[PDB]
Design a protein around this motif. Structure first.
Motif, PDB file in Angstrom:
ATOM      1  N   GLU A 166      38.627 -38.811  76.366  1.00 40.94           N
ATOM      2  CA  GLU A 166      39.678 -39.548  77.053  1.00 40.94           C
ATOM      3  C   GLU A 166      40.880 -39.798  76.155  1.00 40.94           C
ATOM      4  O   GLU A 166      42.016 -39.812  76.639  1.00 40.94           O
ATOM      5  CB  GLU A 166      39.136 -40.871  77.575  1.00 40.94           C
ATOM      6  CG  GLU A 166      40.139 -41.640  78.407  1.00 40.94           C
ATOM      7  CD  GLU A 166      39.653 -43.023  78.778  1.00 40.94           C
ATOM      8  OE1 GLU A 166      38.614 -43.452  78.233  1.00 40.94           O
ATOM      9  OE2 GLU A 166      40.309 -43.681  79.614  1.00 40.94           O
ATOM     10  N   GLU A 178      47.551 -35.250  70.852  1.00 43.30           N
ATOM     11  CA  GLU A 178      48.084 -34.240  71.751  1.00 43.30           C
ATOM     12  C   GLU A 178      48.383 -32.961  70.986  1.00 43.30           C
ATOM     13  O   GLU A 178      48.732 -32.990  69.805  1.00 43.30           O
ATOM     14  CB  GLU A 178      49.359 -34.730  72.433  1.00 43.30           C
ATOM     15  CG  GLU A 178      49.191 -35.995  73.246  1.00 43.30           C
ATOM     16  CD  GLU A 178      48.590 -35.740  74.612  1.00 43.30           C
ATOM     17  OE1 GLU A 178      47.561 -35.038  74.698  1.00 43.30           O
ATOM     18  OE2 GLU A 178      49.156 -36.239  75.606  1.00 43.30           O
ATOM     19  N   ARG A 197      47.701 -22.857  79.855  1.00 44.13           N
ATOM     20  CA  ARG A 197      46.741 -22.815  80.948  1.00 44.13           C
ATOM     21  C   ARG A 197      47.453 -22.400  82.224  1.00 44.13           C
ATOM     22  O   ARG A 197      48.682 -22.390  82.300  1.00 44.13           O
ATOM     23  CB  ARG A 197      46.047 -24.161  81.118  1.00 44.13           C
ATOM     24  CG  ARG A 197      46.985 -25.330  81.029  1.00 44.13           C
ATOM     25  CD  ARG A 197      46.208 -26.618  81.063  1.00 44.13           C
ATOM     26  NE  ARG A 197      45.508 -26.784  82.330  1.00 44.13           N
ATOM     27  CZ  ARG A 197      44.587 -27.713  82.555  1.00 44.13           C
ATOM     28  NH1 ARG A 197      44.248 -28.556  81.592  1.00 44.13           N
ATOM     29  NH2 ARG A 197      44.002 -27.795  83.741  1.00 44.13           N
ATOM     30  N   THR A 257      48.952 -22.681  85.740  1.00 42.93           N
ATOM     31  CA  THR A 257      49.520 -23.743  86.548  1.00 42.93           C
ATOM     32  C   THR A 257      48.830 -23.810  87.903  1.00 42.93           C
ATOM     33  O   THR A 257      48.025 -22.952  88.267  1.00 42.93           O
ATOM     34  CB  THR A 257      51.010 -23.526  86.764  1.00 42.93           C
ATOM     35  OG1 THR A 257      51.543 -24.635  87.494  1.00 42.93           O
ATOM     36  CG2 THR A 257      51.223 -22.266  87.574  1.00 42.93           C
ATOM     37  N   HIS A 258      49.171 -24.839  88.665  1.00 42.97           N
ATOM     38  CA  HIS A 258      48.568 -25.087  89.965  1.00 42.97           C
ATOM     39  C   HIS A 258      49.626 -25.308  91.035  1.00 42.97           C
ATOM     40  O   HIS A 258      49.552 -26.254  91.819  1.00 42.97           O
ATOM     41  CB  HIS A 258      47.626 -26.279  89.895  1.00 42.97           C
ATOM     42  CG  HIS A 258      48.249 -27.483  89.275  1.00 42.97           C
ATOM     43  ND1 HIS A 258      49.122 -28.301  89.957  1.00 42.97           N
ATOM     44  CD2 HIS A 258      48.152 -27.993  88.026  1.00 42.97           C
ATOM     45  CE1 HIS A 258      49.522 -29.273  89.160  1.00 42.97           C
ATOM     46  NE2 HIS A 258      48.948 -29.109  87.982  1.00 42.97           N
ATOM     47  N   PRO A 279      38.030 -40.380  83.560  1.00 39.14           N
ATOM     48  CA  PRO A 279      38.671 -39.087  83.296  1.00 39.14           C
ATOM     49  C   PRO A 279      37.968 -37.898  83.944  1.00 39.14           C
ATOM     50  O   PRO A 279      37.707 -36.884  83.299  1.00 39.14           O
ATOM     51  CB  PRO A 279      38.627 -39.000  81.768  1.00 39.14           C
ATOM     52  CG  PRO A 279      37.407 -39.745  81.410  1.00 39.14           C
ATOM     53  CD  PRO A 279      37.279 -40.868  82.395  1.00 39.14           C
ATOM     54  N   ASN A 280      37.666 -38.015  85.234  1.00 43.19           N
ATOM     55  CA  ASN A 280      37.092 -36.881  85.950  1.00 43.19           C
ATOM     56  C   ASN A 280      38.159 -35.802  86.057  1.00 43.19           C
ATOM     57  O   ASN A 280      39.038 -35.864  86.921  1.00 43.19           O
ATOM     58  CB  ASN A 280      36.597 -37.305  87.329  1.00 43.19           C
ATOM     59  CG  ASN A 280      37.658 -38.012  88.136  1.00 43.19           C
ATOM     60  OD1 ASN A 280      38.438 -38.789  87.594  1.00 43.19           O
ATOM     61  ND2 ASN A 280      37.709 -37.731  89.430  1.00 43.19           N
ATOM     62  N   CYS A 281      38.074 -34.801  85.188  1.00 43.42           N
ATOM     63  CA  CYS A 281      39.166 -33.850  85.046  1.00 43.42           C
ATOM     64  C   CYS A 281      39.244 -32.855  86.190  1.00 43.42           C
ATOM     65  O   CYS A 281      40.238 -32.127  86.286  1.00 43.42           O
ATOM     66  CB  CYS A 281      39.049 -33.117  83.709  1.00 43.42           C
ATOM     67  SG  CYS A 281      39.324 -34.213  82.305  1.00 43.42           S
ATOM     68  N   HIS A 316      40.003 -33.865  88.826  1.00 41.80           N
ATOM     69  CA  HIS A 316      41.159 -34.460  89.482  1.00 41.80           C
ATOM     70  C   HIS A 316      42.032 -35.263  88.523  1.00 41.80           C
ATOM     71  O   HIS A 316      42.799 -36.112  88.974  1.00 41.80           O
ATOM     72  CB  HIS A 316      40.711 -35.318  90.657  1.00 41.80           C
ATOM     73  CG  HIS A 316      40.324 -34.520  91.857  1.00 41.80           C
ATOM     74  ND1 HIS A 316      40.860 -33.280  92.123  1.00 41.80           N
ATOM     75  CD2 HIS A 316      39.446 -34.775  92.854  1.00 41.80           C
ATOM     76  CE1 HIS A 316      40.337 -32.808  93.239  1.00 41.80           C
ATOM     77  NE2 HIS A 316      39.476 -33.696  93.702  1.00 41.80           N
ATOM     78  N   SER A 317      41.938 -35.001  87.212  1.00 45.11           N
ATOM     79  CA  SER A 317      42.974 -35.397  86.249  1.00 45.11           C
ATOM     80  C   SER A 317      43.173 -36.918  86.169  1.00 45.11           C
ATOM     81  O   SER A 317      44.203 -37.453  86.585  1.00 45.11           O
ATOM     82  CB  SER A 317      44.297 -34.691  86.568  1.00 45.11           C
ATOM     83  OG  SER A 317      44.780 -35.041  87.854  1.00 45.11           O
ATOM     84  N   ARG A 318      42.183 -37.604  85.603  1.00 40.08           N
ATOM     85  CA  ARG A 318      42.269 -39.032  85.315  1.00 40.08           C
ATOM     86  C   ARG A 318      42.389 -39.871  86.578  1.00 40.08           C
ATOM     87  O   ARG A 318      43.393 -40.562  86.785  1.00 40.08           O
ATOM     88  CB  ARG A 318      43.458 -39.330  84.396  1.00 40.08           C
ATOM     89  CG  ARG A 318      43.490 -38.480  83.155  1.00 40.08           C
ATOM     90  CD  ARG A 318      42.196 -38.621  82.393  1.00 40.08           C
ATOM     91  NE  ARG A 318      41.830 -40.024  82.243  1.00 40.08           N
ATOM     92  CZ  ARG A 318      42.253 -40.805  81.257  1.00 40.08           C
ATOM     93  NH1 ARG A 318      43.057 -40.318  80.325  1.00 40.08           N
ATOM     94  NH2 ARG A 318      41.870 -42.071  81.200  1.00 40.08           N
ATOM     95  N   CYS A 319      41.369 -39.821  87.417  1.00 40.28           N
ATOM     96  CA  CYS A 319      41.363 -40.543  88.676  1.00 40.28           C
ATOM     97  C   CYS A 319      40.844 -41.960  88.482  1.00 40.28           C
ATOM     98  O   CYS A 319      40.004 -42.225  87.622  1.00 40.28           O
ATOM     99  CB  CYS A 319      40.509 -39.822  89.715  1.00 40.28           C
ATOM    100  SG  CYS A 319      39.676 -40.918  90.886  1.00 40.28           S
TER     101      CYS A 319
END
Lengths: 53, 53
Positions: A38, A42, A47, A49-50, B20-22, B24-27
């Motif tokens: 967590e 940085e 990667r 993109t979406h 940090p369930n990735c 969905h990117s820090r939900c």
């Protein structure tokens, strides 16, 4: 993992296909991972993109 | 017992925090994981989540 598979239902079928193909989890920087934590430092990565288009 | 369950439920309530369930990117979820514990030889683990069961 080692084998990638994909499946979707329609109700009579599971419609699954499988390809034996190596898949790897490459860690950035200098410390190996099992998944990035967590908090920490940085770094510039790359990667897919979406965005739709 | 039920009395102890009452003392647990007397004033406690669920709450929402971030995980940090990735996928969905820090939900931010009601099910926020906090300090999973495992030290038993048999391989059992108990987890202290953020929702009342």
């Amino acid at each position: 993992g080692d084998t990638v598979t994909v499946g979707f239902h329609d109700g009579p079928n599971r419609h699954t296909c499988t390809v034996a193909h190596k898949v790897e989890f490459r860690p950035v920087g200098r410390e190996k991972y099992r998944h990035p934590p967590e908090h920490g430092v940085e770094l510039p990565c790359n990667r897919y993109t979406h965005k739709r288009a | 017992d039920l009395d102890t369950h009452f003392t647990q439920y007397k004033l406690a309530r669920p709450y929402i925090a971030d995980c940090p369930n990735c996928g969905h990117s820090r939900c931010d979820s009601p099910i926020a994981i906090e300090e999973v514990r495992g030290d038993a030889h048999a391989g059992v683990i108990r987890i202290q989540t953020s929702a009342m069961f």
